[PDB]
Amino acid sequence: ADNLAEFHVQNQECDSCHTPDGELSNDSLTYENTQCVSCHGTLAEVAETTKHEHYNAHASHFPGEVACTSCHSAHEKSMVYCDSCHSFDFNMPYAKKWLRDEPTIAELAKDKSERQAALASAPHDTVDVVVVGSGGAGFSAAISATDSGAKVILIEKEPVIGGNAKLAAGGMNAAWTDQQKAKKITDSPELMFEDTMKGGQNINDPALVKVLSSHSKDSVDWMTAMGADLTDVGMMGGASVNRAHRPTGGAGVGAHVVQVLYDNAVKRNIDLRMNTRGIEVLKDDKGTVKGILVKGMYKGYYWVKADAVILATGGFAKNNERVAKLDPSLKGFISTNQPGAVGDGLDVAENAGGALKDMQYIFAHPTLSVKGGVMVTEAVRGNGAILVNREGKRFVNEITTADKASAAILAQTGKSAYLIFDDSVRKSLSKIDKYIGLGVAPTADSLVKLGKMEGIDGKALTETVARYNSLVSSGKDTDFERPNLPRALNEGNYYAIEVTPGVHHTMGGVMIDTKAEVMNAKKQVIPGLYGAGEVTGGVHGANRLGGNAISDIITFGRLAGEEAAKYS
Numbered sequence: 149a150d151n152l153a154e155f156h157v158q159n160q161e162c163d164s165c166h167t168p169d170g171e172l173s174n175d176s177l178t179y180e181n182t183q184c185v186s187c188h189g190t191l192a193e194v195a196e197t198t199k200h201e202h203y204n205a206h207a208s209h210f211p212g213e214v215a216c217t218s219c220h221s222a223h224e225k226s227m228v229y230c231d232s233c234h235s236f237d238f239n240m241p242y243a244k245k246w247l248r249d250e251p252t253i254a255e256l257a258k259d260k261s262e263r264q265a266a267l268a269s270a271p272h273d274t275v276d277v278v279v280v281g282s283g284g285a286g287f288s289a290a291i292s293a294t295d296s297g298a299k300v301i302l303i304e305k306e307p308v309i310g311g312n313a314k315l316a317a318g319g320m321n322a323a324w325t326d327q328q329k330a331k332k333i334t335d336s337p338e339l340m341f342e343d344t345m346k347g348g349q350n351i352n353d354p355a356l357v358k359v360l361s362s363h364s365k366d367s368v369d370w371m372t373a374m375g376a377d378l379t380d381v382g383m384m385g386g387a388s389v390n391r392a393h394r395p396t397g398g399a400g401v402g403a404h405v406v407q408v409l410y411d412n413a414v415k416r417n418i419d420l421r422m423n424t425r426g427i428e429v430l431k432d433d434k435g436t437v438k439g440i441l442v443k444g445m446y447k448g449y450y451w452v453k454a455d456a457v458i459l460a461t462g463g464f465a466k467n468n469e470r471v472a473k474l475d476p477s478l479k480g481f482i483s484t485n486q487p488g489a490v491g492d493g494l495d496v497a498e499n500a501g502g503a504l505k506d507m508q509y510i511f512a513h514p515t516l517s518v519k520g521g522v523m524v525t526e527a528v529r530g531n532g533a534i535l536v537n538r539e540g541k542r543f544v545n546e547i548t549t550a551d552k553a554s555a556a557i558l559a560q561t562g563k564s565a566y567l568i569f570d571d572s573v574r575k576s577l578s579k580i581d582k583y584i585g586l587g588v589a590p591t592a593d594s595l596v597k598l599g600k601m602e603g604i605d606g607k608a609l610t611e612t613v614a615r616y617n618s619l620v621s622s623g624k625d626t627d628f629e630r631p632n633l634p635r636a637l638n639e640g641n642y643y644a645i646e647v648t649p650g651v652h653h654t655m656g657g658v659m660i661d662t663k664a665e666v667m668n669a670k671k672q673v674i675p676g677l678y679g680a681g682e683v684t685g686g687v688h689g690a691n692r693l694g695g696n697a698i699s700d701i702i703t704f705g706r707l708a709g710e711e712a713a714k715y716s
């Protein structure tokens with residue numbers, strides 16, 4: 149057979165997969181995926197038949213219910229979504245090599261044609277609020293508007309939910325929580341605000357940073373009431389005390405928080421549409437929002453009539469061409485992001501009149517795995533790991549800010565460095581087990597052996613760990629001044645992870661005020677239009693602290709949903 153449908157119709161009728169009239173149920177292909185499942189079983193049952201020791205196409209870290217048509221199309225060859233970040237040995241029937249080629253909003257002008265007919269038609273749906281983007285900000289705003297009494301439609305352009313938010317690892321910053329008090333940490337919204345401003349070189353908008361610090365406990369309480377586990381609190385770069393919250397044991401905050409938000413939307417019967425791209429915000433004759441034109445992958449163009457539109461589309465760190473125009477030093481670097489994080493949401497916001505700010509400030513995360521090409525969390529250093537160069541020595545304060553960490557690594561021989569830690573660090577953070585499963589953390593029972601394995605001077609590395617453990621012991625790093633020294637590297641085996649910098653987060657974006665209303669260049673509100681999460685600029689200034697973006701999307705998403713519901 150040349151394709152999956154052809155294969156099955158050798159022994160089955162068209163209605164084994166299609167509805168009685170044959171039309172596709174919707175852009176999420178709900179009815180059609182139910183038919184795949186009635187014969188093959190759920191995703192978990194199929195995964196029983198495709199096990200591999202350390203990976204499995206049908207059982208991954210992605211949260212929610214991943215549709216089969218995400219990777220298996222019927223009438224044409226299709227791509228394995230996992231190939232956008234990894235290179236596992238896979239053999240999916242009727243596959244083709246991963247290639248992302250999505251037209252820009254500008255290029256979709258070509259469809260003037262079909263777009264005009266859609267806009268001349270009656271709205272396909274009439275609701276109060278439309279949220280664009282199924283990341284942490286978009287789910288938060290959809291739930292909060294629904295709880296406030298508004299009828300919502302939430303759209304996602306990708307086949308799977310969660311965007312970059314489902315990948316988060318190290319934590320969600322918040323201050324003065326019940327969770328901190330239980331671990332005996334002392335902190336305050338005032339200290340979180342100060343760390344944040346100084347971390348961002350005082351470019352941040354102070355009014356947005358106050359919303360960030362003052363609503364932070366409330367956002368952790370809201371998530372926990374909905375079923376989240378945020379009881380583990382860790383340290384991240386540039387913070388005065390531990391304040392990065394995550395599940396018990398040090399698991400990834402990201403996949404868990406998005407699973408909780410998805411379960412909660414499903415319980416409220418929230419109309420969630422996949423493979424549906426927001427294209428153009430529509431305004432009436434007095435310039436207030438009247439709806440949004442969308443492009444359904446399977447259904448075509450249509451518009452939804454509504455009082456308010458909330459843009460929660462995330463950043464553009466996967467778009468290296470746009471990144472390089474703003475920061476020529478990052479051209480050619482690998483990204484940590486999902487394949488659709490390209491900035492099309494920003495183009496939608498600007499075409500609607502929104503102005504942008506702080507676009508030149510791009511976060512380069514210092515520690516991508518050279519071997520695996522994926523982010524390695526900053527919590528590995530927060531929980532006690534060190535960095536060494538090819539000469540076997542320390543060269544930087546490992547919990548300094550992302551900008552300084554990346555420069556110091558690129559100044560080392562070969563332009564990369566190695567995280568070094570032991571089994572005490574490994575056991576304090578369950579996420580480290582995931583790196584070991586991926587095959588990017590070689591280990592040995594002595595540093596001489598480890599060094600020999602990875603090309604690091606063995607006797608210098610042994611001396612380096614011995615000296616660092618003495619500094620931990622006495623409580624002061626006189627070589628590089630790391631202010632937090634939580635563990636000696638001396639329990640069980642040793643591990644090494646080769647790391648180098650990659651493109652990760654864009655701190656600029658659409659201008660919003662403290663009620664998350666989008667503004668134009670004269671600082672006027674555009675009525676009915678909201679922005680929440682990494683699509684916005686002004687919260688993080690010149691350098692974002694680790695843990696502050698998950699805090700941002702929950703706070704600003706929830707706020708935007710409440711404000712849109714009230715507005716109408």
Ligand SMILES: Cc1cc2nc3c(=O)[nH]c(=O)nc-3n(C[C@H](O)[C@H](O)[C@H](O)COP(=O)(O)OP(=O)(O)OC[C@H]3O[C@@H](n4cnc5c(N)ncnc54)[C@H](O)[C@@H]3O)c2cc1C
Binds near residue numbers: 484
């Ligand atoms: C690997 C990784 C780990 C991270 N770890 C952390 C952490 O531990 N702590 C932290 O503070 N931050 C962390 N960050 C940053 C944080 O996860 C992101 O800043 C956050 O994902 C922004 O969430 P969001 O809701 O704004 O956008 P996203 O979560 O990116 O979601 C936006 C969604 O919008 C959809 N979308 C875009 N354009 C359109 C359109 N036109 N129509 C419809 N849908 C559209 C996208 O496809 C996407 O699904 C991490 C980021 C990554 C990549």
Ligand code: HEM
Binds near residue numbers: 156180181220
């Ligand atoms: C879009 C929907 C579906 C998907 C993604 C899917 C997936 C697949 C795949 C990947 C294969 C292997 C193909 C090959 O070896 O070339 C397959 C085979 C098969 N499918 Fe489907 N399927 C779908 C719908 C269905 C339905 C509705 C039925 C039954 C009425 C069905 C019954 C089977 C059977 C019987 C086989 C042969 C192997 C076996 O006996 O399990 N499938 N399917």
Ligand code: HEM
Binds near residue numbers: 154156157162164220
């Ligand atoms: C000869 C039998 C079939 C006919 C005439 C038929 C007809 C069609 C048509 C016309 C479309 C496109 C609809 C649109 O864009 O509006 C479509 C799409 C689709 N069909 Fe079929 N179909 C048949 C068999 C199957 C089978 C056997 C399966 C599953 C194994 C299947 C699953 C799907 C899916 C998932 C889509 C969405 C797009 C894609 O994945 O290619 N169909 N079908």
Ligand code: HEM
Binds near residue numbers: 185217219228229241
């Ligand atoms: C319940 C949902 C799904 C169904 C029913 C389905 C069905 C199947 C079947 C029948 C096979 C053939 C394996 C065999 O029989 O040896 C297969 C293989 C495969 N599927 Fe799916 N699939 C689903 C979802 C997905 C998703 C979401 C993805 C990607 C994230 C995916 C990617 C693949 C890959 C890569 C293979 C080949 C596995 C390997 O080489 O180890 N599938 N699928």
Ligand code: HEM
Binds near residue numbers: 203206231315484485
């Ligand atoms: C269904 C699709 C995917 C599968 C089956 C998969 C598989 C895996 C596996 C086997 C690991 C090692 C640890 C573990 O066992 O969980 C892993 C880790 C990782 N993957 Fe994926 N991957 C998928 C898609 C992606 C994509 C598209 C991205 C990036 C946008 C990504 C980012 C990462 C990261 C950052 C890690 C490191 C460990 C962690 O943060 O938990 N993965 N993945």
Ligand SMILES: O=C(O)/C=C/C(=O)O
Binds near residue numbers: 319695697698
């Ligand atoms: O876990 C991390 O390395 C990323 C933290 C962040 O981007 O805030």
Ligand code: NA
Binds near residue numbers: 655656
């Ligand atoms: Na931003």
